[PDB]
Amino acid sequence: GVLTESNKKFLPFQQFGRDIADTTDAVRDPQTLEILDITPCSFGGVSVITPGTNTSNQVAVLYQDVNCTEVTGSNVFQTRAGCLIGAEHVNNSYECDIPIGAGICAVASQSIIAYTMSLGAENSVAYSNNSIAIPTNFTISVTTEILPVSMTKTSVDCTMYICGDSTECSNLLLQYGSFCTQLNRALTGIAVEQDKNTQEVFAQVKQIYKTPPIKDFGGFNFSQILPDPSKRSFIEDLLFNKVTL
Amino acid sequence: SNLLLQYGSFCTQLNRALTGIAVEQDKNTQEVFAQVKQIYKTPPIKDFGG
Amino acid sequence: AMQMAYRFNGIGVTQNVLYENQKLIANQFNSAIGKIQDSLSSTASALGKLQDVVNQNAQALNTLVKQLSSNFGAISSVLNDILSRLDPPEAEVQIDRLITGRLQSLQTYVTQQLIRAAEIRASANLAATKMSECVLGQSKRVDFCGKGYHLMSFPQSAPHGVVFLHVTYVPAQEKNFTTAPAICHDGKAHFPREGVFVSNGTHWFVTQRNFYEPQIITTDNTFVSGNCDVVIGIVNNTVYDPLQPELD
Amino acid sequence: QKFNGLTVLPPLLTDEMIAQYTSALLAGTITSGWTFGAGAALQIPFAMQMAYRFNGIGVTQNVLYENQKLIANQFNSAIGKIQDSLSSTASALGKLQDVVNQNAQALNTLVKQLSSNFGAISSVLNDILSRLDPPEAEVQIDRLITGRLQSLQTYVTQQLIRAAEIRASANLAATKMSECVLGQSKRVDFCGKGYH
Ligand SMILES: *[C@@H]1O[C@H](CO)[C@@H](O[C@@H]2O[C@H](CO)[C@@H](O)[C@H](O)[C@H]2NC(C)=O)[C@H](O)[C@H]1NC(C)=O
Ligand SMILES: *[C@@H]1O[C@H](CO)[C@@H](O[C@@H]2O[C@H](CO)[C@@H](O)[C@H](O)[C@H]2NC(C)=O)[C@H](O)[C@H]1NC(C)=O
Ligand SMILES: *[C@@H]1O[C@H](CO)[C@@H](O[C@@H]2O[C@H](CO)[C@@H](O)[C@H](O)[C@H]2NC(C)=O)[C@H](O)[C@H]1NC(C)=O
Ligand SMILES: *[C@@H]1O[C@H](CO)[C@@H](O)[C@H](O)[C@H]1NC(C)=O
Ligand SMILES: *[C@@H]1O[C@H](CO)[C@@H](O)[C@H](O)[C@H]1NC(C)=O
Ligand SMILES: *[C@@H]1O[C@H](CO)[C@@H](O)[C@H](O)[C@H]1NC(C)=O
Ligand SMILES: *[C@@H]1O[C@H](CO)[C@@H](O)[C@H](O)[C@H]1NC(C)=O
Ligand SMILES: *[C@@H]1O[C@H](CO)[C@@H](O)[C@H](O)[C@H]1NC(C)=O
Ligand SMILES: *[C@@H]1O[C@H](CO)[C@@H](O)[C@H](O)[C@H]1NC(C)=O
Ligand SMILES: *[C@@H]1O[C@H](CO)[C@@H](O)[C@H](O)[C@H]1NC(C)=O
């Protein structure tokens, strides 16, 4: 630690003071009878800022909640998050791709920049106590929205896992009571919950409606969405080839 | 440290769990508050019907 | 067609707007569907809410299995070697160490899985709400099931999830006119029955609040109450009534 | 509080940015009615917006254009009342303070858990490491390590559960902002006791 001079004055019979959770915070030196605080010197996490490997290779480094009075090294800047090395501060602001902290963010013009984030396109609405706007055109638009409903119904058994077909390991395990009963019961419970999740989200209808073969829906195409007996329809296949199970 | 190293990946797992909740709080705040695409600014006059 | 007409009526647009614009709406619909197809086929990483589940579950299982490599401060990891090359007295101690450690790891994994499954159950409850309220019907709560006013949606399956195609109606091409709450006519104060009063500078009409389509101010589409005294901001004008001239 | 290892990372959207957000939202819902939530903002005189929301709740708008003054005065006297009713009364912002202290208690207990011996002969690691030979010190070190690790893991599980609950409340907040600011929800008692 780093040693500083203490305002706290020991009583004539105490040697060293501990602050909380048993860490020696102050100590009296033996050769001078002075009192010194012992504080930990700077330390903390380190993170990297990268625009991705595929884009480029130059990256920045952020030392977390530390001054840059303590230590590649092109430009330094002190932000409320800590020390930013390798990025040049810019004044103008955009919508930022890399969160940092306290609003700062971070590649553009073959370099890594740091800059306070811009909230949005700052425009004003005009107001007057007798004017009203009214739309004349309209666009119907389709948005996707993705939700999860289930995980893999997994199961693990202690007796085969911690022992692995070892008899004496099992004979020693049985002393620990019924931790295996609890674990098997918990996993089976979440498996039951997982099947119930799907059974609830999808089985909302108690018929099976099949559209008539005629597709004249007011001139609305549905051929890209409705099921095709060629394959489960086209769209679900498209998503079905987008996971890495 | 060399003794703890023999305890598997407990330390990294806990650090990752706390990192997860920390990056989740960011999303919570952004999702609650960032529901405007632009930044509307109030007109100077204030005569909203009284 | 009339299903769409009712839904337009529900959002707050008189159903007529559909019929003369049916071909245009169909074309916009199909173009938008093709655009969604293109976006999902080419640009990935819009489906992150399922990739994260699969990847994170797999990673948790992977570290659970990896835990067997660690020696947990015992003499060795593989059980048979210590159980052969140690006397049964010391064997019981080493086995005890390994058992407590591995059991602790397994129980921690189970707790993490419990919390993860609770989060997934919350998401599935929200999915059931969305399916029931924005597929089996039309919902009029803003920014629930779209971005803009809601027209319909279609469910679509996924590997371990569900994806909704929300068909929503977005107004645009605003034009601003001069408005006023009422009209005064013979000391009598006329308010709009449904819609707002508009003026393109010199003449006044009545429209619906989500589509410009002016109509001459008739006594049928405006209920009247009060008088020309207290409404702050009235404007004088005329109110045609079909009843009067037709007798002549 | 943070002494060793423990730390707090600043939140991305710092306080000024959040205040600017809630200024933008407030101005948008003052001038533009609803439409800034759905499409581009369509400015509307505020009296007509109030009348149209009356019409939404099941009352013909004539009542407002005839009683605009009374409505304005009630609104003003209500804002004035609420600001002072928050100013004077203590424990009026509880449901934030409670989570703050509960998290602080968790962290403080986590720190204080160091002092415990867990059956070892000391608590500060350098001293048990500074008066015992390796073959004898290793067992004491192992006991103390497993104790600290079990404490920390308990803390992490606590924080996970609390964060899940706060995330539930934050999704509730997002929903409430969506259908009770951008629009005018008719779900009774969902926002404000009474008609909304
Ligand atoms: C409303 O918006 C639509 C969408 O752009 C307009 O339709 C386009 O009109 C231009 C010229 O009139 C054509 O070149 C485009 O081919 C049209 N698009 C489609 C999809 O048909 C329309 O003109 C706008 N105004 C009205 C009154 O409908
Ligand atoms: C507002 O729109 C009306 C649409 O009819 C315009 O009315 C024009 O002038 C008289 C009004 O009685 C009509 O007989 C004409 O036929 C209209 N012009 C055309 C080309 O049809 C009116 O001029 C518009 N307002 C302004 C300020 O121009
Ligand atoms: C509805 O109740 C309100 C309560 O505020 C009444 O408004 C006030 O009534 C008191 C009663 O003496 C008056 O002194 C105030 O001047 C009124 N306020 C205003 C802004 O005028 C209101 O009168 C009641 N409505 C009816 C129709 O009686
Ligand atoms: C301690 O030792 C130093 C150097 O040997 C000497 O100057 C001093 O007088 C001694 N006593 C105290 C109380 O410092
Ligand atoms: C960092 O060091 C500078 C050196 O002048 C000092 O002024 C500043 O207060 C320090 N920042 C912190 C957070 O200690
Ligand atoms: C950005 O701000 C700095 C701060 O003084 C200023 O020196 C510079 O001219 C500004 N413009 C830039 C860097 O383009
Ligand atoms: C009418 O709209 C235009 C653009 O849509 C805008 O520039 C103008 O300010 C609006 N009218 C008034 C009086 O603000
Ligand atoms: C609208 O605002 C203007 C000030 O810009 C004011 O002079 C006018 O009286 C207001 N309209 C009404 C009907 O009071
Ligand atoms: C719908 O689009 C498909 C192409 O995806 C096309 O083959 C089909 O003819 C279209 N339907 C209509 C009715 O035009
Ligand atoms: C409407 O006409 C009457 C006729 O006497 C007049 O007193 C009143 O001021 C007029 N109102 C407006 C807004 O011009």
GROMACS .gro file of C-alpha atoms in nm, chain B residues 1 3-4 7 10-11 13-15 17-43 47-50, chain D residues 12-13 18 20-22 24 27-28 30-31 36 39 41 46 68 72 76 138 141-142 145-146 149 152-153 155-156 159-160 163 166-167 170-171 173-174 177-178 182:
model
   80
  246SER     CA    1  -0.392  -1.763  -0.608
  248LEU     CA    2  -0.442  -2.277  -0.468
  249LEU     CA    3  -0.761  -2.108  -0.591
  252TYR     CA    4  -1.099  -2.463  -0.804
  255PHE     CA    5  -1.572  -2.045  -1.023
  256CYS     CA    6  -1.410  -1.701  -1.019
  258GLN     CA    7  -1.820  -1.761  -1.363
  259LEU     CA    8  -1.908  -1.516  -1.086
  260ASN     CA    9  -1.735  -1.228  -1.263
  262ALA     CA   10  -2.264  -1.326  -1.380
  263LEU     CA   11  -2.208  -0.980  -1.233
  264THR     CA   12  -2.099  -0.851  -1.574
  265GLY     CA   13  -2.426  -0.986  -1.712
  266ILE     CA   14  -2.643  -0.807  -1.460
  267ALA     CA   15  -2.441  -0.488  -1.506
  268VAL     CA   16  -2.491  -0.485  -1.883
  269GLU     CA   17  -2.856  -0.575  -1.825
  270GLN     CA   18  -2.920  -0.264  -1.613
  271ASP     CA   19  -2.806  -0.052  -1.907
  272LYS     CA   20  -3.070  -0.214  -2.127
  273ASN     CA   21  -3.336  -0.170  -1.859
  274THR     CA   22  -3.278   0.204  -1.840
  275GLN     CA   23  -3.254   0.247  -2.216
  276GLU     CA   24  -3.570   0.045  -2.279
  277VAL     CA   25  -3.774   0.241  -2.024
  278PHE     CA   26  -3.652   0.585  -2.127
  279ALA     CA   27  -3.541   0.566  -2.493
  280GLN     CA   28  -3.889   0.542  -2.643
  281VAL     CA   29  -3.855   0.858  -2.851
  282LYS     CA   30  -3.683   0.860  -3.189
  283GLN     CA   31  -3.614   1.235  -3.185
  284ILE     CA   32  -3.569   1.512  -2.928
  285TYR     CA   33  -3.870   1.740  -2.918
  286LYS     CA   34  -3.810   2.086  -2.775
  287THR     CA   35  -4.083   2.292  -2.614
  288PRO     CA   36  -4.196   2.608  -2.794
  292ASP     CA   37  -5.010   2.945  -2.354
  293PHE     CA   38  -5.144   2.591  -2.343
  294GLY     CA   39  -5.506   2.695  -2.300
  295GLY     CA   40  -5.417   2.827  -1.955
  555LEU     CA   41  -2.432   0.477  -1.949
  556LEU     CA   42  -2.718   0.727  -1.965
  561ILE     CA   43  -3.213   1.106  -1.869
  563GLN     CA   44  -3.320   1.555  -2.139
  564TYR     CA   45  -3.515   1.243  -2.240
  565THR     CA   46  -3.798   1.319  -2.001
  567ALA     CA   47  -3.834   1.563  -2.480
  570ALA     CA   48  -4.279   1.841  -2.461
  571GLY     CA   49  -4.387   1.591  -2.725
  573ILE     CA   50  -4.775   1.850  -2.444
  574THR     CA   51  -4.776   1.977  -2.802
  579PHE     CA   52  -4.544   1.154  -3.186
  582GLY     CA   53  -4.582   0.851  -3.645
  584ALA     CA   54  -4.542   1.452  -3.449
  589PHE     CA   55  -5.348   2.178  -2.616
  611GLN     CA   56  -6.184   2.526  -1.969
  615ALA     CA   57  -5.702   2.476  -1.590
  619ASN     CA   58  -5.265   2.417  -1.156
  681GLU     CA   59  -0.197  -2.461   0.300
  684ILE     CA   60  -0.553  -2.118   0.352
  685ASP     CA   61  -0.789  -2.375   0.200
  688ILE     CA   62  -1.064  -1.973   0.078
  689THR     CA   63  -1.363  -2.205   0.071
  692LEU     CA   64  -1.589  -1.829  -0.188
  695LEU     CA   65  -1.925  -1.453  -0.236
  696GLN     CA   66  -2.132  -1.707  -0.427
  698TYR     CA   67  -2.394  -1.280  -0.254
  699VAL     CA   68  -2.393  -1.331  -0.631
  702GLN     CA   69  -2.785  -1.008  -0.663
  703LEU     CA   70  -2.908  -1.225  -0.950
  706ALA     CA   71  -3.179  -0.796  -1.061
  709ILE     CA   72  -3.593  -0.511  -1.078
  710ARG     CA   73  -3.601  -0.616  -1.442
  713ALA     CA   74  -3.857  -0.208  -1.530
  714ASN     CA   75  -4.052  -0.394  -1.797
  716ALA     CA   76  -4.233   0.072  -1.624
  717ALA     CA   77  -4.171   0.046  -1.999
  720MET     CA   78  -4.481   0.466  -2.017
  721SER     CA   79  -4.589   0.323  -2.351
  725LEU     CA   80  -4.775   0.805  -2.553
   0.00000   0.00000   0.00000
